Protein backbone atom coordinates (compact mmCIF):
# COMPACT_ATOMS: atom_id res chain seq x y z
CA UNK A 1 0.00 0.00 0.00
CA UNK A 2 2.94 2.39 0.79
CA UNK A 3 4.62 2.08 -2.74
CA UNK A 4 1.04 2.32 -4.39
CA UNK A 5 0.67 5.55 -2.88
CA UNK A 6 4.53 6.82 -3.62
CA UNK A 7 3.95 5.95 -7.35
CA UNK A 8 0.58 7.91 -7.41
CA UNK A 9 2.04 10.96 -6.65
CA UNK A 10 4.59 10.70 -8.46
CA UNK A 11 2.19 10.03 -11.52
CA UNK A 12 0.58 13.64 -9.90
CA UNK A 13 4.00 15.39 -10.04
CA UNK A 14 5.15 13.90 -13.42
CA UNK A 15 1.65 15.58 -15.09
CA UNK A 16 2.33 19.22 -13.36
CA UNK A 17 5.44 19.23 -14.22
CA UNK A 18 4.66 18.52 -18.01
CA UNK A 19 1.49 21.16 -18.17
CA UNK A 20 4.09 23.44 -16.58
CA UNK A 21 7.01 22.82 -19.09
CA UNK A 22 4.04 23.12 -22.26
CA UNK A 23 3.14 26.96 -20.48
CA UNK A 24 6.16 28.21 -19.73
CA UNK A 25 6.82 27.46 -23.65
CA UNK A 26 4.26 28.77 -24.91
CA UNK A 27 4.66 31.85 -22.92
CA UNK A 28 8.20 32.45 -23.97
CA UNK A 29 7.09 32.38 -28.38
CA UNK A 30 4.64 35.07 -26.92
CA UNK A 31 7.50 36.98 -25.53
CA UNK A 32 9.50 36.44 -28.40
CA UNK A 33 6.92 37.78 -30.87
CA UNK A 34 6.29 40.91 -28.49
CA UNK A 35 9.88 41.69 -28.59
CA UNK A 36 9.80 41.19 -32.74
CA UNK A 37 7.21 43.77 -32.73
CA UNK A 38 8.44 46.14 -30.23
CA UNK A 39 11.54 46.54 -32.78
CA UNK A 40 9.46 46.81 -35.93
CA UNK A 41 7.73 49.52 -34.51
CA UNK A 42 10.24 51.94 -35.05
CA UNK A 43 9.75 52.38 -38.96
CA UNK A 44 6.73 54.61 -38.85
CA UNK A 45 8.39 56.96 -36.23
CA UNK A 46 11.73 57.43 -38.50
CA UNK A 47 9.82 58.38 -41.50
CA UNK A 48 7.53 61.02 -39.43
CA UNK A 49 10.84 62.50 -37.90
CA UNK B 1 48.55 -16.26 12.48
CA UNK B 2 49.37 -18.66 15.28
CA UNK B 3 51.09 -19.51 18.29
CA UNK B 4 51.66 -22.10 20.83
CA UNK B 5 52.64 -21.95 24.07
CA UNK B 6 55.67 -23.62 26.23
CA UNK B 7 55.89 -24.62 30.08
CA UNK B 8 59.66 -23.45 31.02
CA UNK B 9 61.03 -24.97 34.24
CA UNK B 10 63.97 -23.17 35.81
CA UNK B 11 62.65 -19.73 34.62
CA UNK B 12 63.07 -16.80 37.50
CA UNK B 13 59.30 -15.28 37.61
CA UNK B 14 57.70 -16.15 34.20
CA UNK B 15 55.25 -19.46 34.24
CA UNK B 16 55.07 -20.03 29.95
CA UNK B 17 55.99 -18.83 27.03
CA UNK B 18 53.85 -17.18 23.93
CA UNK B 19 55.74 -17.39 20.30
CA UNK B 20 53.81 -15.49 17.74
CA UNK B 21 53.55 -17.64 14.54
CA UNK B 22 52.50 -16.91 10.82
CA UNK B 23 51.58 -20.00 8.91
CA UNK B 24 51.48 -19.87 5.23
CA UNK B 25 50.09 -22.37 2.34
CA UNK B 26 51.51 -22.76 -1.08
CA UNK B 27 48.44 -23.19 -3.17
CA UNK B 28 50.60 -24.72 -5.99
CA UNK B 29 51.81 -27.55 -4.90
CA UNK B 30 49.74 -27.66 -1.43
CA UNK B 31 52.75 -27.49 0.37
CA UNK B 32 52.80 -25.23 4.33
CA UNK B 33 55.34 -23.47 5.95
CA UNK B 34 55.67 -22.00 9.96
CA UNK B 35 57.75 -18.85 10.19
CA UNK B 36 58.22 -16.99 13.46
CA UNK B 37 58.78 -13.46 12.92
CA UNK B 38 61.77 -12.05 15.07
CA UNK B 39 61.17 -9.89 18.07
CA UNK B 40 63.36 -7.64 19.55
CA UNK B 41 64.85 -8.55 22.67
CA UNK B 42 63.75 -12.27 23.06
CA UNK B 43 66.99 -14.93 22.97
CA UNK B 44 65.26 -17.54 21.49
CA UNK B 45 66.82 -17.97 17.72
CA UNK B 46 64.02 -16.93 15.62
CA UNK B 47 63.08 -17.57 12.28
CA UNK B 48 61.85 -20.18 10.07
CA UNK B 49 60.25 -23.17 12.59
CA UNK B 50 58.93 -25.93 9.85
CA UNK B 51 60.57 -25.97 6.20
CA UNK B 52 58.24 -26.00 3.33
CA UNK B 53 56.98 -29.58 3.00
CA UNK B 54 53.79 -31.34 3.56
CA UNK B 55 52.54 -31.74 6.39
CA UNK B 56 50.80 -35.13 7.25
CA UNK B 57 47.69 -35.16 9.84
CA UNK B 58 47.42 -38.66 10.27
CA UNK B 59 49.37 -41.54 11.39
CA UNK B 60 48.07 -43.00 7.82
CA UNK B 61 49.92 -40.25 5.51
CA UNK B 62 47.01 -38.05 4.82
CA UNK B 63 48.25 -34.52 4.75
CA UNK B 64 47.06 -31.40 5.04
CA UNK B 65 44.37 -29.41 2.91
CA UNK B 66 43.17 -25.50 2.60
CA UNK B 67 39.56 -27.16 3.13
CA UNK B 68 40.47 -28.18 7.26
CA UNK B 69 41.59 -24.58 8.04
CA UNK B 70 40.17 -22.04 9.60
CA UNK B 71 39.89 -19.53 12.85
CA UNK B 72 40.03 -20.62 16.75
CA UNK B 73 40.97 -24.43 15.89
CA UNK B 74 43.93 -26.24 17.01
CA UNK B 75 46.65 -27.56 14.31
CA UNK B 76 49.43 -30.23 15.40
CA UNK B 77 52.45 -30.67 13.56
CA UNK B 78 55.68 -32.27 14.44
CA UNK B 79 54.63 -32.32 18.52
CA UNK B 80 53.53 -28.95 18.46
CA UNK B 81 49.81 -27.63 18.52
CA UNK B 82 49.26 -24.11 17.13
CA UNK B 83 46.47 -21.75 17.87
CA UNK B 84 45.28 -20.10 14.76
CA UNK B 85 43.88 -17.01 16.00
CA UNK B 86 43.52 -14.56 12.81
CA UNK B 87 43.81 -14.93 9.39
CA UNK B 88 44.96 -12.43 5.86
CA UNK B 89 43.08 -10.33 3.92
CA UNK B 90 43.18 -12.29 1.02
CA UNK B 91 42.98 -15.63 2.70
CA UNK B 92 39.64 -14.23 4.28
CA UNK B 93 38.22 -13.25 0.54
CA UNK B 94 39.11 -17.01 -0.32
CA UNK B 95 37.48 -19.15 2.04
CA UNK B 96 34.23 -17.65 1.49
CA UNK B 97 34.32 -17.69 -2.09
CA UNK B 98 35.22 -21.89 -2.00
CA UNK B 99 32.16 -22.33 0.35
CA UNK B 100 33.76 -22.33 3.92
CA UNK B 101 32.75 -19.71 6.01
CA UNK B 102 35.79 -18.85 8.44
CA UNK B 103 35.07 -18.44 12.55
CA UNK B 104 34.57 -15.37 14.00
CA UNK B 105 37.89 -13.96 15.19
CA UNK B 106 39.94 -14.07 18.18
CA UNK B 107 43.20 -12.56 20.09
CA UNK B 108 46.23 -13.74 20.55
CA UNK B 109 47.64 -13.83 23.73
CA UNK B 110 50.81 -11.86 24.69
CA UNK B 111 54.55 -13.21 26.06
CA UNK B 112 54.18 -11.84 29.43
CA UNK B 113 58.64 -11.36 29.07
CA UNK B 114 58.31 -8.80 26.33
CA UNK B 115 55.60 -7.20 28.29
CA UNK B 116 57.33 -6.82 30.91
CA UNK B 117 60.81 -5.25 29.51
CA UNK B 118 58.37 -1.84 27.97
CA UNK B 119 60.24 1.09 28.76
CA UNK B 120 57.74 3.81 31.15
CA UNK B 121 56.39 7.01 28.95
CA UNK B 122 58.85 10.41 30.10
CA UNK B 123 56.30 12.68 29.88
CA UNK B 124 54.09 14.61 32.34
CA UNK B 125 50.80 16.41 32.33
CA UNK B 126 50.88 20.10 32.50
CA UNK B 127 49.00 22.03 35.57
CA UNK B 128 46.35 23.74 35.40
CA UNK B 129 46.64 27.59 35.60
CA UNK B 130 43.77 28.42 38.61
CA UNK B 131 45.96 29.58 41.21
CA UNK B 132 45.76 32.41 44.19
CA UNK B 133 46.45 34.80 41.68
CA UNK B 134 44.40 33.64 38.85
CA UNK B 135 41.70 33.65 41.43
CA UNK B 136 42.87 37.35 42.72
CA UNK B 137 42.39 38.37 39.19
CA UNK B 138 39.03 37.85 38.30
CA UNK B 139 37.05 37.25 41.57
CA UNK B 140 38.18 40.67 43.70
CA UNK B 141 35.46 42.67 45.36
CA UNK B 142 33.10 39.87 44.95
CA UNK B 143 31.25 39.00 47.90
CA UNK B 144 28.52 36.73 48.97
CA UNK B 145 26.16 37.71 51.59
CA UNK B 146 23.51 35.24 53.46
CA UNK B 147 21.06 36.34 56.42
CA UNK B 148 20.70 33.03 58.91
CA UNK C 1 14.04 -11.92 13.03
CA UNK C 2 17.42 -10.81 10.54
CA UNK C 3 15.28 -10.30 7.16
CA UNK C 4 13.21 -7.91 9.58
CA UNK C 5 15.79 -5.92 10.55
CA UNK C 6 18.02 -5.84 7.58
CA UNK C 7 14.62 -4.51 6.00
CA UNK C 8 14.20 -1.61 8.95
CA UNK C 9 17.30 -0.57 8.64
CA UNK C 10 17.81 -0.10 4.63
CA UNK C 11 14.34 1.70 4.78
CA UNK C 12 15.56 4.24 7.59
CA UNK C 13 18.40 5.08 5.63
CA UNK C 14 15.51 6.81 3.08
CA UNK C 15 17.06 10.03 1.28
CA UNK C 16 17.33 13.53 3.20
CA UNK C 17 14.16 15.71 3.63
CA UNK C 18 11.12 13.47 3.01
CA UNK C 19 11.46 10.20 5.62
CA UNK C 20 7.91 9.65 6.59
CA UNK C 21 6.28 7.34 9.33
CA UNK C 22 3.48 5.42 8.82
CA UNK C 23 1.02 2.12 9.78
CA UNK C 24 4.07 0.12 8.61
CA UNK C 25 6.94 1.25 10.44
CA UNK C 26 5.05 0.58 13.81
CA UNK C 27 4.63 -2.31 12.63
CA UNK C 28 7.73 -3.39 11.80
CA UNK C 29 9.02 -1.92 15.14
CA UNK C 30 6.73 -4.38 16.63
CA UNK C 31 7.68 -7.24 14.46
CA UNK C 32 11.46 -7.10 15.62
CA UNK C 33 10.51 -6.05 19.34
CA UNK C 34 8.02 -9.02 19.68
CA UNK C 35 10.83 -11.84 17.80
CA UNK C 36 13.46 -10.32 20.55
CA UNK C 37 10.98 -10.82 23.41
CA UNK C 38 9.66 -14.38 22.42
CA UNK C 39 13.11 -15.99 21.55
CA UNK C 40 13.52 -15.63 25.39
CA UNK C 41 10.59 -18.02 25.23
CA UNK C 42 12.01 -20.58 23.52
CA UNK C 43 15.46 -20.80 25.30
CA UNK C 44 13.49 -20.75 28.66
CA UNK C 45 11.59 -23.81 27.29
CA UNK C 46 15.15 -25.12 26.42
CA UNK C 47 16.60 -24.66 30.03
CA UNK C 48 12.61 -26.74 31.40
CA UNK C 49 12.96 -29.50 29.14
CA UNK D 1 24.69 11.82 -20.65
CA UNK D 2 23.15 8.61 -21.16
CA UNK D 3 26.44 7.08 -22.69
CA UNK D 4 28.29 8.09 -20.06
CA UNK D 5 26.21 6.43 -17.36
CA UNK D 6 25.52 3.20 -18.76
CA UNK D 7 29.42 3.37 -19.03
CA UNK D 8 29.21 2.76 -15.15
CA UNK D 9 27.83 -0.91 -15.43
CA UNK D 10 29.86 -3.97 -13.30
CA UNK D 11 32.32 -6.40 -15.12
CA UNK D 12 30.29 -8.96 -16.45
CA UNK D 13 27.28 -6.60 -17.51
CA UNK D 14 28.88 -4.75 -19.80
CA UNK D 15 26.85 -5.97 -23.29
CA UNK D 16 26.91 -4.37 -26.34
CA UNK D 17 23.52 -4.41 -27.36
CA UNK D 18 20.67 -2.52 -29.71
CA UNK D 19 20.92 0.47 -27.48
CA UNK D 20 24.48 1.15 -27.39
CA UNK D 21 24.68 1.13 -30.96
CA UNK D 22 21.76 2.94 -31.42
CA UNK D 23 23.09 5.71 -29.52
CA UNK D 24 25.40 5.76 -31.31
CA UNK D 25 23.75 6.37 -34.46
CA UNK D 26 21.92 9.09 -32.81
CA UNK D 27 24.99 11.13 -31.79
CA UNK D 28 26.07 11.44 -35.48
CA UNK D 29 22.96 11.99 -36.72
CA UNK D 30 22.35 14.86 -34.26
CA UNK D 31 25.66 16.00 -35.13
CA UNK D 32 25.11 15.89 -39.07
CA UNK D 33 21.75 17.87 -38.68
CA UNK D 34 23.85 20.71 -36.95
CA UNK D 35 26.13 20.74 -39.46
CA UNK D 36 23.31 21.10 -42.14
CA UNK D 37 21.71 24.00 -39.84
CA UNK D 38 25.16 25.44 -39.77
CA UNK D 39 25.24 25.91 -43.78
CA UNK D 40 21.82 27.23 -44.27
CA UNK D 41 22.35 29.80 -41.89
CA UNK D 42 25.80 30.88 -43.58
CA UNK D 43 23.66 30.93 -47.02
CA UNK D 44 21.00 33.03 -45.05
CA UNK D 45 23.04 36.03 -44.24
CA UNK D 46 24.89 35.59 -47.75
CA UNK D 47 21.72 36.23 -49.41
CA UNK D 48 21.18 39.41 -46.51
CA UNK D 49 23.69 40.94 -47.66
CA UNK D 50 22.50 40.54 -51.26
CA UNK D 51 19.21 41.90 -50.38
CA UNK D 52 20.61 44.71 -48.76
CA UNK E 1 18.98 -36.40 -18.44
CA UNK E 2 21.18 -33.11 -19.80
CA UNK E 3 21.46 -32.44 -16.13
CA UNK E 4 23.84 -34.91 -14.89
CA UNK E 5 26.96 -34.10 -12.80
CA UNK E 6 28.35 -37.36 -14.13
CA UNK E 7 31.58 -36.95 -12.53
CA UNK E 8 29.71 -36.77 -8.77
CA UNK E 9 27.23 -39.35 -9.62
CA UNK E 10 29.41 -42.03 -10.22
CA UNK E 11 31.13 -40.78 -6.84
CA UNK E 12 28.12 -41.15 -5.09
CA UNK E 13 26.78 -45.01 -6.52
CA UNK E 14 30.90 -45.96 -5.82
CA UNK E 15 30.25 -44.83 -2.34
CA UNK E 16 26.60 -46.77 -2.21
CA UNK E 17 28.40 -49.96 -3.72
CA UNK E 18 31.50 -49.66 -1.35
CA UNK E 19 29.01 -48.93 1.47
CA UNK E 20 27.39 -52.00 1.11
CA UNK E 21 30.66 -54.26 0.67
CA UNK E 22 31.82 -53.00 4.17
CA UNK E 23 28.47 -53.76 5.18
CA UNK E 24 28.92 -57.63 4.19
CA UNK E 25 32.31 -57.52 5.66
CA UNK E 26 31.10 -56.73 9.04
CA UNK E 27 28.25 -59.03 8.53
CA UNK E 28 30.56 -61.60 7.66
CA UNK E 29 30.48 -65.27 9.21
CA UNK E 30 33.34 -67.23 7.98
CA UNK E 31 35.86 -64.41 7.28
CA UNK E 32 35.82 -65.51 3.46
CA UNK E 33 35.48 -61.84 2.21
CA UNK E 34 38.15 -59.32 2.24
CA UNK E 35 38.11 -56.11 4.04
CA UNK E 36 37.41 -52.94 2.26
CA UNK E 37 40.55 -50.86 2.95
CA UNK E 38 38.82 -47.26 2.61
CA UNK E 39 36.74 -47.44 5.67
CA UNK E 40 39.51 -47.91 8.21
CA UNK E 41 40.14 -45.28 10.40
CA UNK E 42 43.41 -43.82 10.76
CA UNK F 1 30.08 -31.96 4.78
CA UNK F 2 31.88 -31.68 1.75
CA UNK F 3 28.51 -32.12 -0.17
CA UNK F 4 27.52 -28.74 2.02
CA UNK F 5 30.62 -26.84 1.38
CA UNK F 6 30.23 -27.46 -2.63
CA UNK F 7 26.45 -26.19 -2.27
CA UNK F 8 27.64 -23.25 -0.73
CA UNK F 9 30.01 -22.29 -3.22
CA UNK F 10 27.34 -22.75 -5.46
CA UNK F 11 25.14 -20.41 -3.30
CA UNK F 12 28.62 -17.51 -3.13
CA UNK F 13 28.23 -17.57 -7.36
CA UNK F 14 24.80 -17.25 -7.24
CA UNK F 15 24.38 -13.99 -4.95
CA UNK F 16 27.88 -12.38 -6.90
CA UNK F 17 25.67 -12.65 -9.87
CA UNK F 18 23.01 -10.77 -7.93
CA UNK F 19 24.69 -8.27 -6.42
CA UNK F 20 25.55 -6.72 -9.73
CA UNK F 21 22.37 -7.45 -11.78
CA UNK F 22 20.69 -4.86 -9.35
CA UNK F 23 23.55 -2.33 -10.29
CA UNK F 24 22.12 -3.32 -13.38
CA UNK F 25 18.62 -2.19 -12.70
CA UNK F 26 20.17 0.93 -11.00
CA UNK F 27 21.71 2.26 -14.02
CA UNK F 28 19.15 1.19 -16.54
CA UNK F 29 16.65 2.98 -14.43
CA UNK F 30 18.63 6.33 -14.24
CA UNK F 31 18.66 5.85 -17.97
CA UNK F 32 15.20 5.43 -18.89
CA UNK F 33 14.37 8.35 -16.18
CA UNK F 34 15.77 11.14 -18.54
CA UNK F 35 13.90 13.27 -20.62
CA UNK F 36 14.52 16.43 -22.68
CA UNK F 37 14.58 19.21 -20.10
CA UNK F 38 16.12 18.00 -16.59
CA UNK F 39 18.48 19.04 -14.40
CA UNK F 40 22.51 17.57 -14.59
CA UNK F 41 22.21 16.52 -17.48
CA UNK F 42 26.12 17.52 -19.22
CA UNK F 43 28.22 16.65 -22.39
CA UNK F 44 31.30 13.76 -21.79
CA UNK F 45 34.65 14.54 -22.50
CA UNK F 46 35.56 11.93 -25.01
CA UNK F 47 32.38 9.70 -25.04
CA UNK F 48 31.21 7.71 -28.33
CA UNK F 49 33.52 5.01 -27.55
CA UNK F 50 32.57 1.45 -26.67
CA UNK F 51 35.15 -0.06 -23.84
CA UNK F 52 37.32 -2.51 -23.93
CA UNK F 53 35.66 -4.52 -21.03
CA UNK F 54 32.45 -4.78 -23.09
CA UNK F 55 30.86 -8.76 -23.54
CA UNK F 56 28.16 -9.37 -26.03
CA UNK F 57 24.29 -10.60 -25.43
CA UNK F 58 24.87 -14.12 -26.21
CA UNK F 59 28.06 -14.49 -23.51
CA UNK F 60 25.52 -12.89 -21.12
CA UNK F 61 23.34 -15.26 -21.73
CA UNK F 62 25.83 -18.31 -22.06
CA UNK F 63 26.67 -17.23 -18.63
CA UNK F 64 23.32 -16.75 -16.71
CA UNK F 65 22.06 -19.98 -18.21
CA UNK F 66 25.48 -21.71 -17.25
CA UNK F 67 24.77 -20.34 -13.36
CA UNK F 68 21.29 -21.48 -13.21
CA UNK F 69 22.56 -25.19 -14.67
CA UNK F 70 25.33 -25.61 -12.41
CA UNK F 71 23.30 -24.70 -9.31
CA UNK F 72 20.68 -27.10 -10.70
CA UNK F 73 23.15 -29.64 -10.46
CA UNK F 74 23.90 -29.35 -6.98
CA UNK F 75 20.88 -29.33 -5.97
CA UNK F 76 20.26 -32.66 -7.54
CA UNK F 77 23.39 -33.78 -5.81
CA UNK F 78 22.16 -32.81 -2.50
CA UNK F 79 18.86 -34.12 -3.03
CA UNK F 80 20.18 -37.51 -3.96
CA UNK F 81 22.69 -37.73 -1.06
CA UNK F 82 19.82 -36.97 1.12
CA UNK F 83 18.63 -40.38 0.43
CA UNK F 84 21.64 -41.83 0.58
CA UNK F 85 22.09 -40.66 3.66
CA UNK F 86 18.54 -42.08 4.83
CA UNK F 87 19.32 -45.31 3.77
CA UNK F 88 22.67 -45.72 5.55
CA UNK F 89 20.74 -44.51 8.75
CA UNK F 90 18.20 -47.51 8.06
CA UNK F 91 20.58 -49.92 7.47
CA UNK F 92 22.58 -49.31 10.92
CA UNK F 93 19.24 -49.25 12.72
CA UNK F 94 18.25 -52.28 11.59
CA UNK F 95 21.29 -53.95 11.83
CA UNK F 96 21.61 -53.27 15.54
CA UNK F 97 18.28 -54.19 16.55
CA UNK F 98 18.74 -57.52 15.43
CA UNK F 99 21.90 -58.06 16.46
CA UNK F 100 20.80 -57.18 20.04
CA UNK F 101 17.29 -59.62 20.12
CA UNK F 102 20.35 -62.66 18.97
CA UNK F 103 22.19 -61.88 21.55
CA UNK F 104 19.45 -61.55 24.29
CA UNK F 105 18.08 -65.19 23.42
CA UNK G 1 9.22 32.61 -11.25
CA UNK G 2 8.37 30.34 -13.36
CA UNK G 3 11.73 29.00 -13.83
CA UNK G 4 12.27 29.21 -9.84
CA UNK G 5 8.96 26.91 -9.69
CA UNK G 6 9.90 24.65 -12.25
CA UNK G 7 13.60 24.12 -10.29
CA UNK G 8 11.57 23.65 -7.16
CA UNK G 9 9.10 20.87 -9.52
CA UNK G 10 11.97 19.17 -10.42
CA UNK G 11 13.54 18.41 -7.00
CA UNK G 12 11.07 17.42 -5.30
CA UNK G 13 10.09 14.63 -8.55
CA UNK G 14 14.01 13.23 -8.26
CA UNK G 15 13.27 12.85 -4.32
CA UNK G 16 10.32 11.36 -5.15
CA UNK G 17 11.56 9.05 -7.36
CA UNK G 18 14.73 8.05 -4.92
CA UNK G 19 11.92 7.34 -2.38
CA UNK G 20 9.81 4.97 -4.64
CA UNK G 21 12.95 2.66 -5.52
CA UNK G 22 14.34 2.50 -2.19
CA UNK G 23 10.53 1.61 -0.90
CA UNK G 24 9.92 -0.97 -3.58
CA UNK G 25 13.36 -2.59 -3.29
CA UNK G 26 13.10 -2.74 0.07
CA UNK G 27 9.87 -4.58 -0.79
CA UNK G 28 11.01 -7.19 -3.17
CA UNK G 29 13.31 -8.76 -0.81
CA UNK G 30 12.42 -12.16 1.08
CA UNK G 31 13.94 -14.53 3.59
CA UNK G 32 16.94 -15.59 2.05
CA UNK G 33 17.66 -12.81 -0.29
CA UNK G 34 21.25 -11.26 -0.06
CA UNK G 35 22.56 -8.22 2.07
CA UNK G 36 21.90 -9.30 5.30
CA UNK G 37 23.97 -8.90 8.90
CA UNK G 38 24.50 -7.97 12.38
CA UNK G 39 22.24 -5.43 14.10
CA UNK G 40 24.02 -2.15 15.20
CA UNK G 41 20.74 -1.01 17.76
CA UNK G 42 19.28 0.40 14.42
CA UNK G 43 15.73 -0.47 16.00
CA UNK G 44 15.80 2.04 18.16
CA UNK G 45 17.72 4.78 15.98
CA UNK G 46 14.23 6.85 14.69
CA UNK G 47 14.99 9.95 12.66
CA UNK G 48 11.89 10.15 10.61
CA UNK G 49 11.22 13.79 10.03
CA UNK G 50 7.75 13.93 8.39
CA UNK G 51 4.24 12.46 9.18
CA UNK G 52 1.88 11.55 6.08
CA UNK G 53 -0.21 14.73 6.61
CA UNK G 54 2.44 17.26 6.44
CA UNK G 55 4.06 15.27 3.15
CA UNK G 56 0.52 15.24 1.58
CA UNK G 57 -0.09 19.09 2.36
CA UNK G 58 3.55 19.52 0.95
CA UNK G 59 2.95 17.84 -2.58
CA UNK G 60 -0.52 19.82 -2.70
CA UNK G 61 0.91 22.85 -1.83
CA UNK G 62 3.61 22.96 -4.21
CA UNK G 63 0.58 21.78 -6.84
CA UNK G 64 -1.42 24.48 -6.11
CA UNK G 65 1.38 26.79 -6.00
CA UNK G 66 1.97 25.65 -9.79
CA UNK G 67 -1.41 26.08 -10.65
CA UNK G 68 -1.97 29.35 -9.55
CA UNK G 69 1.11 30.10 -11.33
CA UNK G 70 0.10 28.87 -14.69
CA UNK G 71 -3.50 31.22 -14.60
CA UNK G 72 -1.45 34.27 -14.03
CA UNK G 73 0.70 32.91 -17.05
CA UNK G 74 -2.47 32.27 -18.80
CA UNK G 75 -4.11 35.91 -18.16
CA UNK G 76 -0.30 37.49 -18.68
CA UNK G 77 -0.69 36.10 -22.29
CA UNK G 78 -3.89 37.46 -22.80
CA UNK G 79 -2.98 40.39 -21.97
CA UNK G 80 0.07 41.09 -24.23
CA UNK G 81 -2.00 39.67 -27.10
CA UNK G 82 -4.73 42.06 -26.82
CA UNK G 83 -2.41 44.89 -25.98
CA UNK G 84 -0.42 44.34 -29.43
CA UNK G 85 -4.07 44.14 -31.35
CA UNK G 86 -4.99 47.70 -29.64
CA UNK G 87 -1.32 49.45 -30.67
CA UNK G 88 -1.84 47.83 -34.54
CA UNK G 89 -5.40 49.47 -34.91
CA UNK G 90 -3.96 52.37 -33.55
CA UNK G 91 -0.85 53.03 -35.98
CA UNK G 92 -2.89 51.77 -38.80
CA UNK G 93 -5.22 54.19 -38.21
CA UNK G 94 -3.36 57.35 -37.53
CA UNK G 95 -1.33 56.68 -40.85
CA UNK G 96 -4.44 56.72 -42.60
CA UNK G 97 -5.28 60.18 -41.10
CA UNK G 98 -1.98 61.89 -42.00
CA UNK H 1 11.18 9.82 -33.71
CA UNK H 2 15.44 8.85 -32.74
CA UNK H 3 14.39 9.48 -28.72
CA UNK H 4 11.23 7.68 -29.09
CA UNK H 5 13.09 4.59 -30.69
CA UNK H 6 16.06 4.77 -28.04
CA UNK H 7 13.50 4.73 -25.60
CA UNK H 8 11.45 1.46 -26.36
CA UNK H 9 15.16 -0.48 -27.03
CA UNK H 10 15.96 0.66 -23.53
CA UNK H 11 12.40 -0.53 -22.15
CA UNK H 12 13.43 -4.24 -23.87
CA UNK H 13 16.79 -3.93 -22.11
CA UNK H 14 15.29 -3.24 -18.82
CA UNK H 15 12.74 -6.20 -19.52
CA UNK H 16 15.47 -8.79 -19.83
CA UNK H 17 17.46 -7.99 -17.15
CA UNK H 18 14.18 -8.03 -15.14
CA UNK H 19 13.74 -11.49 -16.11
CA UNK H 20 16.72 -12.90 -15.36
CA UNK H 21 17.03 -11.53 -12.01
CA UNK H 22 14.09 -13.19 -11.35
CA UNK H 23 15.30 -16.29 -12.72
CA UNK H 24 18.35 -16.44 -10.33
CA UNK H 25 16.39 -15.60 -7.51
CA UNK H 26 13.98 -18.41 -7.48
CA UNK H 27 17.59 -20.62 -8.23
CA UNK H 28 18.93 -19.09 -5.40
CA UNK H 29 15.72 -19.79 -2.90
CA UNK H 30 15.70 -23.58 -4.03
CA UNK H 31 18.94 -23.75 -3.42
CA UNK H 32 19.31 -22.46 -0.27
CA UNK H 33 16.29 -24.45 1.09
CA UNK H 34 18.13 -28.18 0.32
CA UNK H 35 21.07 -26.38 1.92
CA UNK H 36 19.14 -26.29 5.38
CA UNK H 37 17.28 -29.67 4.90
CA UNK H 38 21.04 -31.17 4.47
CA UNK H 39 22.56 -29.48 7.76
CA UNK H 40 19.25 -31.29 9.39
CA UNK H 41 20.66 -34.86 8.41
CA UNK H 42 23.84 -33.19 9.21
CA UNK H 43 22.89 -32.84 12.77
CA UNK H 44 21.04 -36.47 12.80
CA UNK H 45 24.46 -38.15 11.74
CA UNK H 46 26.13 -36.40 14.56
CA UNK H 47 23.14 -37.42 17.57
CA UNK H 48 23.48 -41.14 15.71
CA UNK H 49 27.53 -41.33 16.10
CA UNK H 50 27.05 -39.79 19.66
CA UNK H 51 24.56 -42.18 21.09
CA UNK H 52 26.36 -45.16 19.14
Same mark, same amino acid.
Given at each position: ???????????????? @?????????? @??????????????????????? | ????????? %? *????????????? #? #?????? /? %? /????????? /????????? +?????? +??????? #????????????????????????????????? /??????????? %???????????????????? *?????? +??????? +???????? | ???????????????????????????? !??? !??? !??????????????? | ?? &??????????? &??????????????????????? &?????????????? &?? | ?????????????????????????????????????????? | ????????????????????????????????????????????????????????????????????????????????????????????????????????? | ?????????????????????????????????????????????????????????????????????????????????????????????????? | ????????????????????????????????????????????????????
Amino acid at each position: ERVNDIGFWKSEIIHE @LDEMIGETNA @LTDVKKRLERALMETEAPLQVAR | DAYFQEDVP %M *STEEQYRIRQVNI #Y #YYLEDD /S %M /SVIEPVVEN /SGILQGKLI +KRQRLA +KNDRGDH #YHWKDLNRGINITIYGKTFRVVDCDQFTQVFLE /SQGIELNPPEK %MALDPYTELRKQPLRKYVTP *SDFDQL +KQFLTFD +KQVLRFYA | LKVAQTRLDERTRRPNIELCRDMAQLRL !VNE !VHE !VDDTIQTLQQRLRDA | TR &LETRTHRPNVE &LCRDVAQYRLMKEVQEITHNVAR &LKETLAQAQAELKG &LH | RFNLDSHRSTELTNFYQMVQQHRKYYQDKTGTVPRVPYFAMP | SEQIRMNRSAKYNLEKDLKDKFVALTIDDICFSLNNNSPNIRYSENAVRIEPNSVSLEDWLDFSSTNVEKADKQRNNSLMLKALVDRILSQTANDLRKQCDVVDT | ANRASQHELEKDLSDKQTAYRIDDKCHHLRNTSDGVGYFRGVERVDATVSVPESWAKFTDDNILRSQSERAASAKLRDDIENLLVVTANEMWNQFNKV | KSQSDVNKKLEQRLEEVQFWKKELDDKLEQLVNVTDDLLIYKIRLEKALETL
